[PDB]
Amino acid sequence: VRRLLGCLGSETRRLSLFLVLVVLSSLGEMAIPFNLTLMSILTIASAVLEFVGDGIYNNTMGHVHSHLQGEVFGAVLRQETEFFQQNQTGNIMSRVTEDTSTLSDSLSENLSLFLWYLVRGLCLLGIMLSVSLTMVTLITLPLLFLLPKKVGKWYQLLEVQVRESLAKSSQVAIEALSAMPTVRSFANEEGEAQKFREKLQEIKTLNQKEAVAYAVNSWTTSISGMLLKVGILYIGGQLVTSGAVSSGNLVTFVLYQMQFTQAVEVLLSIYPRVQKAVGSSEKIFEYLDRTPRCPPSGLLTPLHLEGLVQFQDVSFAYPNRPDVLVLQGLTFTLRPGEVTALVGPNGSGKSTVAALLQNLYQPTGGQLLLDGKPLPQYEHRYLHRQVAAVGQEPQVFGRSLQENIAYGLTQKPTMEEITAAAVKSGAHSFISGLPQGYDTEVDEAGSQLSGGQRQAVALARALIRKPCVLILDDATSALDANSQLQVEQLLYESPERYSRSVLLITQHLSLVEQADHILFLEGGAIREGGTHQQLMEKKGCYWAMVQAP
Amino acid sequence: MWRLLKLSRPDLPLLVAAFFFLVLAVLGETLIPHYSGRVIDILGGDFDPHAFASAIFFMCLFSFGSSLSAGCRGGCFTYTMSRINLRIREQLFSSLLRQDLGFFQETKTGELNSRLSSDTTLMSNWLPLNANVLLRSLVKVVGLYGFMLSISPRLTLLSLLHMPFTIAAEKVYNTRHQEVLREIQDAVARAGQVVREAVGGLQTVRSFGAEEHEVCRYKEALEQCRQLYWRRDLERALYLLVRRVLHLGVQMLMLSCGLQQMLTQGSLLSFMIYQESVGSYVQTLVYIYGDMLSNVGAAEKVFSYMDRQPNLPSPGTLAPTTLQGVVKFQDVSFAYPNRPDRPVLKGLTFTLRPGEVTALVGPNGSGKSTVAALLQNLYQPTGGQVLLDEKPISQYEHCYLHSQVVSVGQEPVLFSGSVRNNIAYGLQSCEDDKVMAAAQAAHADDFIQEMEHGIYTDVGEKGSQLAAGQKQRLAIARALVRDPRVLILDQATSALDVQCEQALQDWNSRGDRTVLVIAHRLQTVQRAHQILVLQEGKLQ
């Protein structure tokens, strides 16, 4: 239950400057009432107290909120890649945003209520001190803790499924919204509405039990307080006949007794809210304490680097389906100033080789070396700056073109190299056509651009880092015959070709004739390897692929 | 400000019923402080066997009835204030799924998800947050009012004077609060966009090592929300302080009106503290009324999304049994509604025959995919006509038109269902033989057997578990499972290898299907009956 002290104590200093004030108000209540402004000068002073407490406490609570949401999201980004496909996007959105918001508001209300009533209850206990009747009340008090102890676990188990179904409904909503042309082109809006209602049925089912649980809790709290009041008043009335104390002695003792019961039933009411918040902080605190299974960032940052890449007996298996092995026996070498073209049928695993080269995953039974050193040894930023790739499906984010091209660079290159990289990739030939120049805005997922424009923007983004290892993977799929020769120049006519190691994965057989090396990958195994003429002279699978038409 | 009460109609047999457990509360509570005194005065008037037990029985029954009403009221209120939220969420999603395409480019997906997941609780938060103290308070106020009705003929100058102090500031505050109550939403939802742009492109972002960049952007977005929250809390606390400070004016005025008579000191000095109390409770009343109205009115954006009408044309009722398949363009010129006054098509005009293959070629940005998307009645041409047979395409039934005319887009987007739930997308019911036939027709059955669970394999978001060629084959099978009459496919040869491309050369081997194909490599479309070339949005 007390899992919050590790994420609140850093603010407690400010809370100290609240807590003293709390008793500065509490003794205001305990003090007896002791000149036409005599009722004024005190009263507005009390109002000033009502400005200094909640003026400060709220100023701390936001610092608890905006920090915590800055941490949990960070705990999302440290996890491994295969986590992000095990948990859907909508689930991560829901657990990042609304669970944290609900926990923060629940804490911000319940902490203030708990303090402001515990101090008053302690003062009310202190002021009434016959010792014997007070001790009788204090021994019958801890009997009432038996039922919320059995109620809190039910509350946690009930609220966890509420959060799960809300997250699933949000995932359905965002998946329906993010693919709107595909939804409308098949006329399947009613299916998405049906899926949303099917998700909301579980929420209604759990809420109809939440209401009953709240009603039973209020019933038990009021019944327990009432019965204890009748018990203490009865035993007092029976003790009156044996003398005990005077009428005026007990006429205030019973009043302080019912005030103490009023103080304690509020804590009895807020115990289930504490249990509900504890249940609400379940999936979030799993994200914070989860150990990422990927290796951490390295520390080497060599000032001089060559594009020497070695694959030695690399075998990989996807963690979703670990009983199969996608890659069996990869072993090859990439040198600077050379072009290696990796070709094969669909389902071979060329994108898996690209993912292994970019340190997205880890090999199962092999060695991958960059300049004689393993990939996790290098620093994360330096490694992803020295290795650049395009990918089969490029993605562009919703900002300016000059920020999409220079994305991820902390150095912040100026205008000149941005324009040079846009000219080199051929993107500038339409970028100057836009009315706002390079400062134009493109929306989410690049819906304002065509396929060739998106591929050109991705290529210009990958070019501007001046990488030593470059991976092109179907970068010429959507490009026409006019722009693609630029890519061909980028492979064979640019003077910077000697400074890069290019890994080309294309199904266009025109670009692989001039490659220094050609690899044929089928079933996760290298079938043929050599130059173009050596493969053409011998009879093999590459010859069949060429001579198929 | 009114429409949400129209959303409270199915909750009619609860809410007023909840008010029943309200009044059965106070009808007990108004008999609580009197007879409880009958329990304490017997301390000085000790009569154990008869009066004490009767007083205890009556007090126990009264408190038992009050608690039994209060618990049922709380259960009914907690059920209703979640049913309202569920109805609002469902109706908002059903309204969002109905609007046009151009609405989705102005706004962002994170904004709509934040409107779904954060503003609806703000709608449903208009319940009185603290109510038990309010119910004890109203009974106490009624009792104090009944006790101070003994000073009636001098209270004629008191009730009227309690109205107009510091109320002219109230009409200020409910303005200055409400705009803040909107702005925080416009600072929350935009911040909720940031967690989109990382997560949905996580495999992109880790490809460049920009995690700290996204974390910095998220913390910068959170700082503005923290500042707005602090501003709202400070303004509310300052208003409360100034109200409590300036409340004493009527107190000192009535103190002067009491002391000007020098009824005596035992009748006015022991009288002032109760109206000095209940002034705070009537201030609480007006404060909760203002806060409730502000919380209701702080969702003008959600109400506008509720009431927004699309620019889609009137739906058609036409759905004939036969369909020839002749397609005609009549001087069609189209400009996107998001970026107007820049035409993309500049007077296209052609005809598609039922039984021949028409290929379309053009450079990047020339507008071929715009033609393909316009042919499916996704958009509206500003000039010219798009005719299917002899009738305009907008006059057809939606499901019938999108079951007869189908397209394979530039980039297929897949969903998080099974493979059978993705091939049969948009179909109410279909047999497994149709799915198997469409799988053989697209050469997709060779890798259906390879993956686990057969055809019931789970496929993640956007087809992440599959490769690009398998996704292309699944999209082709999804298009072919409907047995269409008009089939538009653009760049279906993006990721397929040479063998599959040669094995899937002739789409028109059936000989009774209108096919439109868009390709960049001109050698692939040498078998087309008709070839169309367009430059800068004009046919050559």
Ligand SMILES: Nc1ncnc2c1ncn2[C@@H]1O[C@H](COP(=O)(O)OP(=O)(O)OP(=O)(O)O)[C@@H](O)[C@H]1O
């Ligand atoms: N995230 C993943 N989880 C599980 N299996 C995967 C995943 N990504 C790919 N696979 C599987 O790995 C194999 C090859 O994947 P990959 O995308 O690397 O193929 P490819 O040969 O590069 O594709 P293509 O020729 O279509 O470009 C397939 O069997 C595919 O189902």
Ligand SMILES: Nc1ncnc2c1ncn2[C@@H]1O[C@H](COP(=O)(O)OP(=O)(O)OP(=O)(O)O)[C@@H](O)[C@H]1O
């Ligand atoms: N949704 C959109 N909103 C605004 N402009 C758009 C939109 N879709 C396309 N455009 C613009 O229309 C022009 C061409 O669009 P389109 O995608 O139809 O071209 P295309 O020539 O078919 O593309 P490709 O390069 O894929 O062959 C470009 O200037 C592009 O920016």
Ligand SMILES: [Mg+2]
């Ligand atoms: Mg691939």
Ligand SMILES: [Mg+2]
């Ligand atoms: Mg196009």
